[PDB]
Amino acid sequence: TRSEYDRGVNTFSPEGRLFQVEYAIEAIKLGSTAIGIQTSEGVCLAVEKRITSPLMEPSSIEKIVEIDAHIGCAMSGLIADAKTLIDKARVETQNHWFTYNETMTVESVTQAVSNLALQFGEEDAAMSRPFGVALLFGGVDEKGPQLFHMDPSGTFVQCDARAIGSASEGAQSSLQEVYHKSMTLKEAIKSSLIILKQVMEEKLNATNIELATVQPGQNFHMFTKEELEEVIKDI
Amino acid sequence: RNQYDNDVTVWSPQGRIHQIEYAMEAVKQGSATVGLKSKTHAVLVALKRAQSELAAHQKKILHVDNHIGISIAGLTADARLLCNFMRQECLDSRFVFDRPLPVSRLVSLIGSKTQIPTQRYGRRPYGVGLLIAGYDDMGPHIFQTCPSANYFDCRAMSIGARSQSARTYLERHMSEFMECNLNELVKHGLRALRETLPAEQDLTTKNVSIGIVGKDLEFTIYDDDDVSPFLEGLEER
Amino acid sequence: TGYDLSASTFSPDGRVFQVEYAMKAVENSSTAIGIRCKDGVVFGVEKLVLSKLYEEGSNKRLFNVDRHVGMAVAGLLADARSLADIAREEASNFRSNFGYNIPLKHLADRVAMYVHAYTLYSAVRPFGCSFMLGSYSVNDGAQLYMIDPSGVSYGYWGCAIGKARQAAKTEIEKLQMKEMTCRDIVKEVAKIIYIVHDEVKDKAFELELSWVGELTNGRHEIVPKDIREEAEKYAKESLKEEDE
Amino acid sequence: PLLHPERFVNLGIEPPKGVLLFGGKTLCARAVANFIRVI
Amino acid sequence: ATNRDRKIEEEARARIMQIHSRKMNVSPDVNYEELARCTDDFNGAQCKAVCVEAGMIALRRGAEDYMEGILEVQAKKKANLQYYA
Amino acid sequence: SYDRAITVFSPDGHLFQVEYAQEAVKKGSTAVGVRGRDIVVLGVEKKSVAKLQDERTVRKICALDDNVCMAFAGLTADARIVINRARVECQSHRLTVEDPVTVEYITRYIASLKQRYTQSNGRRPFGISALIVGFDFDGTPRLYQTDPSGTYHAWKANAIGRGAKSVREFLEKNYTDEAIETDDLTIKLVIKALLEVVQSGGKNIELAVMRRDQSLKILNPEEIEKYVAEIEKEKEENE
Amino acid sequence: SAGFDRHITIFSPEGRLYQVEYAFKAINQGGLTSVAVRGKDCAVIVTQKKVPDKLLDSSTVTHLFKITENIGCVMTGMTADSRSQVQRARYEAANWKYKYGYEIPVDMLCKRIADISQVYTQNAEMRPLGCCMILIGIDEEQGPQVYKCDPAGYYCGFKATAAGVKQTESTSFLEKKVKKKFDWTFEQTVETAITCLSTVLSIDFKPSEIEVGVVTVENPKFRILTEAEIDAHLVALAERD
Numbered sequence A: 001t002r003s004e005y006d007r008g009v010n011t012f013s014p015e016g017r018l019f020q021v022e023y024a025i026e027a028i029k030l031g032s033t034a035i036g037i038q039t040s041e042g043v044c045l046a047v048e049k050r051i052t053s054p055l056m057e058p059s060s061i062e063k064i065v066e067i068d069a070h071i072g073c074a075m076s077g078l079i080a081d082a083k084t085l086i087d088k089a090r091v092e093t094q095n096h097w098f099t100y101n102e103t104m105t106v107e108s109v110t111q112a113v114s115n116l117a118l119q120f121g122e123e124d125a126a127m128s129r130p131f132g133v134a135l136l137f138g139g140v141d142e143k144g145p146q147l148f149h150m151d152p153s154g155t156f157v158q159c160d161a162r163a164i165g166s167a168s169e170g171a172q173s174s175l176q177e178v179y180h181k182s183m184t185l186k187e188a189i190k191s192s193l194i195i196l197k198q199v200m201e202e203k204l205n206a207t208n209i210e211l212a213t214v215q216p217g218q219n220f221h222m223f224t225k226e227e228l229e230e231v232i233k234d235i
Numbered sequence B: 001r002n003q004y005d006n007d008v009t010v011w012s013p014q015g016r017i018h019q020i021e022y023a024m025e026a027v028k029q030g031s032a033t034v035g036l037k038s039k040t041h042a043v044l045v046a047l048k049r050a051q052s053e054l055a056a057h058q059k060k061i062l063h064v065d066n067h068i069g070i071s072i073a074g075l076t077a078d079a080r081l082l083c084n085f086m087r088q089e090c091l092d093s094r095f096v097f098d099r100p101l102p103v104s105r106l107v108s109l110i111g112s113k114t115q116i117p118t119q120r121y122g123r124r125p126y127g128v129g130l131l132i133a134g135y136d137d138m139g140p141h142i143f144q145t146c147p148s149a150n151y152f153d154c155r156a157m158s159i160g161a162r163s164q165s166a167r168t169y170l171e172r173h174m175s176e177f178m179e180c181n182l183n184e185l186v187k188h189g190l191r192a193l194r195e196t197l198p199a200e201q202d203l204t205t206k207n208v209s210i211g212i213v214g215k216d217l218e219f220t221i222y223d224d225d226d227v228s229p230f231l232e233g234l235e236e237r
Numbered sequence C: 001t002g003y004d005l006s007a008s009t010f011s012p013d014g015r016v017f018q019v020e021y022a023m024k025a026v027e028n029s030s031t032a033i034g035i036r037c038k039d040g041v042v043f044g045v046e047k048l049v050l051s052k053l054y055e056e057g058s059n060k061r062l063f064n065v066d067r068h069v070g071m072a073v074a075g076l077l078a079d080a081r082s083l084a085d086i087a088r089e090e091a092s093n094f095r096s097n098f099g100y101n102i103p104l105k106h107l108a109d110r111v112a113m114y115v116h117a118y119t120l121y122s123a124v125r126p127f128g129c130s131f132m133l134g135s136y137s138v139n140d141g142a143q144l145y146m147i148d149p150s151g152v153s154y155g156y157w158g159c160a161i162g163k164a165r166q167a168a169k170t171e172i173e174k175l176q177m178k179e180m181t182c183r184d185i186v187k188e189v190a191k192i193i194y195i196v197h198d199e200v201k202d203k204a205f206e207l208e209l210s211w212v213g214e215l216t217n218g219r220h221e222i223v224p225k226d227i228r229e230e231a232e233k234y235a236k237e238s239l240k241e242e243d244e
Numbered sequence D: 001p002l003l004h005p006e007r008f009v010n011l012g013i014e015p016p017k018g019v020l021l022f023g024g025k026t027l028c029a030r031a032v033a034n035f036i037r038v039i
Numbered sequence E: 001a002t003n004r005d006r007k008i009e010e011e012a013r014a015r016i017m018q019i020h021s022r023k024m025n026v027s028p029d030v031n032y033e034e035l036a037r038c039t040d041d042f043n044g045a046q047c048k049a050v051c052v053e054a055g056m057i058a059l060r061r062g063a064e065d066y067m068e069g070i071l072e073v074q075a076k077k078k079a080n081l082q083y084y085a
Numbered sequence F: 001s002y003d004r005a006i007t008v009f010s011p012d013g014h015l016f017q018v019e020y021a022q023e024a025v026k027k028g029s030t031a032v033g034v035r036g037r038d039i040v041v042l043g044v045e046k047k048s049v050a051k052l053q054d055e056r057t058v059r060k061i062c063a064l065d066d067n068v069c070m071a072f073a074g075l076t077a078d079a080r081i082v083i084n085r086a087r088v089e090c091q092s093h094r095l096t097v098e099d100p101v102t103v104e105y106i107t108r109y110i111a112s113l114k115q116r117y118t119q120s121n122g123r124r125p126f127g128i129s130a131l132i133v134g135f136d137f138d139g140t141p142r143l144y145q146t147d148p149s150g151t152y153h154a155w156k157a158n159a160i161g162r163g164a165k166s167v168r169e170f171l172e173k174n175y176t177d178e179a180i181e182t183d184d185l186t187i188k189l190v191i192k193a194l195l196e197v198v199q200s201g202g203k204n205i206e207l208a209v210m211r212r213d214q215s216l217k218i219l220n221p222e223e224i225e226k227y228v229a230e231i232e233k234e235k236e237e238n239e
Numbered sequence G: 001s002a003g004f005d006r007h008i009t010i011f012s013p014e015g016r017l018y019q020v021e022y023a024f025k026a027i028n029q030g031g032l033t034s035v036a037v038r039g040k041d042c043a044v045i046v047t048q049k050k051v052p053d054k055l056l057d058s059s060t061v062t063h064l065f066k067i068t069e070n071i072g073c074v075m076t077g078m079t080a081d082s083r084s085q086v087q088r089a090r091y092e093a094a095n096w097k098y099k100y101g102y103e104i105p106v107d108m109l110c111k112r113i114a115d116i117s118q119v120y121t122q123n124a125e126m127r128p129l130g131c132c133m134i135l136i137g138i139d140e141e142q143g144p145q146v147y148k149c150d151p152a153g154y155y156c157g158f159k160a161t162a163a164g165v166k167q168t169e170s171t172s173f174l175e176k177k178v179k180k181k182f183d184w185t186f187e188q189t190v191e192t193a194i195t196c197l198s199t200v201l202s203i204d205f206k207p208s209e210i211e212v213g214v215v216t217v218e219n220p221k222f223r224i225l226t227e228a229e230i231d232a233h234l235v236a237l238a239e240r241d
């Protein structure tokens, strides 16, 4: 019976559900897992890079990207939708800086990206299907470090610690167990890397992960091979 | 059925449209909210959901122009679109007429806007039920608007999943209204939401959202610790 | 069937099943009646308060479209509101265009135009509600018309639309409308509404009236509280007399 | 209603029989039993 | 009796409720009029399911229970979706 | 019925028709690309033609600019359209900003073009895969690969088309810094990797070479014959 | 060969537009009937009236409309479509007079309406509105004219015709009458039309259950015959038959 109520994004099922939106939410899973953690010292993003074969130089699997000098976006889903939404986020941050001569709040930028993702089939904007990608915006603003999760349905919500991607269900419980409100950035990094090792196919070693941090201070930083090895030494 | 509910533009062979009914059912897929008013105050109280214990609670009450707020029950997308439309309309009304927009006219415009998609196959019906609590020169107003472009002027109403219990409570206690202070009004609303909630749980400062407007009182939203003065004094079952 | 989908395909019999379904939908809502007395017109409607939470005056089904025209709706209230807005907008255009008040016959013709335009195409559905226009003027007497999903504008001395339309028409037929005055035709309307209303099924009930006539100086408006109270009292007394 | 079905009659409800296991059906049923084998 | 010459095409729902709750320990305070109000066309089969689930709530949860039973006949597991509805 | 629509999702969350476009790509003659220290090379299988057919009208290697070349695998008409638009945009970018296009920029533009064509419902995806090999304005042997789904990555050496998997595995095994130390070992590796699919080695091979600050050069068939002779001699000697 | 029926622009394997045929079937759906007949120097239309109630306003209820100051039309079929087509014809006639400076010939108006109907048939945007429209008028040169605007764009001119449920029987009677002494007086043509209606409906008409419109060379203005005039004609013809 679920074959006539999901031919279009603008068709309601008897349960009053947007099955196409639900289907895109399901599509979210295919991507590699990402974990973001908020702490009073900042926010940390760690993503399981999923190199399908070596000889692929790592600077093309962009699961963590930079939004302005104060936010980082972790992606899970279609690379095309990832690129489109990342471009929108960057353009919106720069436009807000140009207009109001300030730095957009993480909540505001996530809201703008969600506003772009809202337009499903509205004949007034031209995408026609949900953006099969889930994003984690971790940044620093006047309200202290913050982290937000946005899903294809345009819904965004604050999250002091969240995980998305293929290892979403298995990592959410680990985050719940290991999370106490007060940590340090190093503690969050260690916990996130431990969870990644728990829910990663490969042995966690130097490459195959990416780690980024935004702190009330130095701008968004991508940990290089040296720091990655240093942390992996005593995860 | 099975061939008369594939789009909103086709009449079923019974004098009914099935997509509109499907939207009016989807409206009941959201968290419970209720609203009501005294002779000098209008209030909304709603149960903001938590997707997970880690993730904070998604916001519920949306702050339309200072003399108006709304509570949503339905698709986040349609809720955001309608909230933006409300804000733009109120700003335009304030810009052209140097005075706030009447809530009746606001809800009429919303009804027409939500009706137009219910006829032409160009977009699905707006899947959200709205409780608009506003204050105009006439006095506090509580309005309901449903995806079927039907809007009612309600003295005390509930919407969302498990709204029957709150509606029954409001029916029983409507006699009290119109002669209650703001504290008693919020207590009435909180009791209605407690009744609609299942027994083993309760209302916590974390998960309850309150919004009040009235005389010389622009719309104010209380959440988290802000609601403590209400819950603390609220009586227990 | 196969030919019922979309309103642009004729069935082998030549019937537009979508418009027929629109007629069926309108013949499923609360009842409304109107009568054209000799020097005016009166509308009444049996509103159904689906829940006591609604305040009085909610779901007003007797709109006013331009000062002199009243419009009583029956069917889908969303389409009713949309059609009321269209009627107001057409009347405003006419007043702007011609510097004089819009005749009710012409207004009904324009709204029938609009309804038929909607029922023609295949990307839109036929209007799922009928209605009645009424007006009174010095230079035009009293006029009443009824428009339905198909968009026909037959004139009327009186009419009933909705669930119980045939019984209401039968009751109306036995009245001296051509000579009776507003003050008594209002009471007759209230009596007819109370007679035709089904209490054992519709449960809730409210009686809503309006008129336009010379005594109103040819300006439509709702009933005063006292007049409505007296009319409903007369209707209740007539109902008791019939019950006896 | 295996160790204390009489609670149903105590509360005034009739404890019925007949449950459809429509769908690990076999071993789930065996664990529930933990016997009437059928072909 | 089929589904496709003399063919044949709140109160009744309430009556069905009492009839099927007759062999129970129903408390007198129950407002079967309220139960029938909170029906929205639920036919006699749904009323039977509501009474059966009232008995099942007597089993589990001990036994408001009628409201919960009718809601679970509606099958409001509600499977909370990521998108609001 | 979860198919035959670019803008419809399946339970696993797939876009089956763009996946089908990738499958259509998989049905094209093999094209390998490699990057060296100062040389970037593209090899392509020829498949040969009937003697009555002219050769200059068949192209799998096309120069998108002075410092960027493009190898192709997929549908020929889509190839022509994409290459034409890519050249147009290369020159347009040169106009907009007075700096030659970077390989990353041009491959991103091609990926965006494919994405735009696969977003909507009234358009068919460009059923092609492309390898963009070039030298940035600072000097660097960059190589990217773009798929029909609008996704582009950066590689050091990759093969697309029919023999994609086998040739990629061979490059995986026999790609090393010493194997690309000089500007002849890279070519030898390219012919070695293509010989597992092509038959003659010289009659079914086309090589294009880009050297830093030097225009593209297509290797002569005699030069290819000499090179394949060198590889054969090396193999027999190692035997 | 059954699937070629749900669209207007799909040709059946035998080359048939079943949708336009169904439009004709809808023409034969209003129940009513109408007849038109042209005499030596005048044309007259008469249509059955149905007011099955004392509550309806017979004044407004009608099927005759003056398309302009010298051209009249009788509608049959769906009433909404009839009124829409009548208004379109009125607009076309006014536009013609404005653009060219002389009133629209009846054949011209009929042709324009036919062209509009054919456009609707060809382009799958609207259903072909199912009303059959008969025009009567006076041409300064050719004399009286009568035409049809069936919902397929065919607009042949006539000496006398009928539309509606009983069009076949009316046509048979009219051809029988016209085969002998086709040239008729005003009274003769009115009698022919009325007796055709009476015999084909197997009933005689009271003055209220009938509408008549007339155009004459002497008075080339579409005029609706009043109850008194129609009753006088009825009684005179019945007496003198």
Ligand SMILES: Nc1ncnc2c1ncn2[C@@H]1O[C@H](COP(=O)(O)OP(=O)(O)OP(=O)(O)O)[C@@H](O)[C@H]1O
Pocket (backbone or CB within 6 Å): D024, D025, D026, D027, D028
């Ligand atoms: N919840 C469970 N607990 C223990 N074992 C389980 C469970 N679910 C499945 N299994 C395993 O499944 C097998 C038992 O399943 P069983 O033989 O009943 O098949 P089935 O899934 O009912 O299939 P079918 O009825 O279609 O033949 C055993 O291997 C058992 O270990």
